[PDB]
Write a protein that binds this ligand. Structure first.
Ligand SMILES: CC(C)(COP(=O)(O)OP(=O)(O)OC[C@H]1O[C@@H](n2cnc3c(N)ncnc32)[C@H](O)[C@@H]1OP(=O)(O)O)[C@@H](O)C(=O)NCCC(=O)NCCS
Ligand SMILES: CC(=O)NCCc1ccccc1
Length: 210
């Protein structure tokens, strides 16, 4: 038995402890790179918390067994200066992940898909404790975000998935692909950067209109 609760920034340490145990070690990109200690990813993960739309799954003992960290994304201003997230990163392995993210954003803008939308919910970090996987926790974390969206007049939930495996979970939850890129085709400087196992395939950006 578990609950789904809003994460407070004072939960930051417990969220990071959980992510270090699971996500830092078992997201397909993190594990491919053997990420290790990564304070930049800790910083990245804590950033969306004050947006007040991130959720934790908590077991009967009060331990965090899952999180979905979300941030609000606003349509770029007409005079927007696009910045590469990778430019502010010192960690070489995480920089590769940020560079991949920058590349996706250079190729695909979710706001082009939804010209009328000013604000979109962005699902940034999804992680469930191994012993609690396959129980629908990812779905219940996601569903709680629908409540936030309803309350705040947000229509679109956008989630960049790091593998076809997790994209399939989002499909089950009613999301559909809006962009994809195979790892085999991601060659920023002429050569492949990510070579995880074949079934991962590549990134898929998933979206749902609620
Ligand atoms: C992706 C992830 C959050 C899914 O969470 P979840 O709460 O287990 O989600 P679900 O319960 O819907 O299970 C998803 C699928 O995992 C598989 N599964 C079943 N039992 C499982 C288990 N004990 N362990 C792992 N996977 C299992 C099933 O294929 C299941 O689909 P199905 O129940 O519809 O048949 C989780 O696997 C995870 O933390 N992965 C590592 C980090 C990651 O990749 N995050 C997403 C980045 S986009
Ligand atoms: C929804 C979700 O969890 N996307 C993960 C992207 C990602 C971010 C940082 C490191 C590795 C991978």
């Amino acid at each position: 038995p578990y609950t789904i609760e809003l994460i407070q920034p004072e939960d930051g340490e417990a969220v990071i402890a959980m992510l270090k145990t699971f996500f830092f070690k078992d997201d397909p990109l993190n594990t491919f790179l053997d990420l290790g200690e990564c304070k930049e990813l800790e910083k990245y993960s804590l950033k969306p918390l004050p947006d007040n739309c991130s959720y934790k799954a908590v077991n009967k003992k009060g331990e965090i067994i899952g999180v979905f960290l979300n941030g609000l994304m606003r349509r770029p201003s007409p005079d927007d200066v696009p910045e590469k997230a990778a430019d502010s990163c010192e960690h070489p392995k995480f920089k590769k992940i940020l560079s991949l993210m920058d590349h996706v954003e250079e190729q695909f803008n979710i706001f082009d898909v939804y010209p009328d939308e000013e604000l979109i919910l962005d699902g940034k970090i999804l992680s469930v404790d191994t012993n609690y996987r396959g129980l629908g926790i990812a779905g219940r974390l996601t569903e709680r975000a629908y409540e936030y969206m309803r309350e705040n007049g947000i229509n679109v939930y956008h989630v960049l998935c790091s593998s076809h495996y997790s994209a399939r979970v989002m499909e089950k939850l009613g999301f559909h692909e809006v962009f994809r890129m195979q790892f085999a085709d991601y060659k920023p400087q002429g050569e492949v950067v990510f070579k995880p196992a074949a079934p991962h395939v590549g990134i898929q950006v998933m979206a749902k209109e609620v």
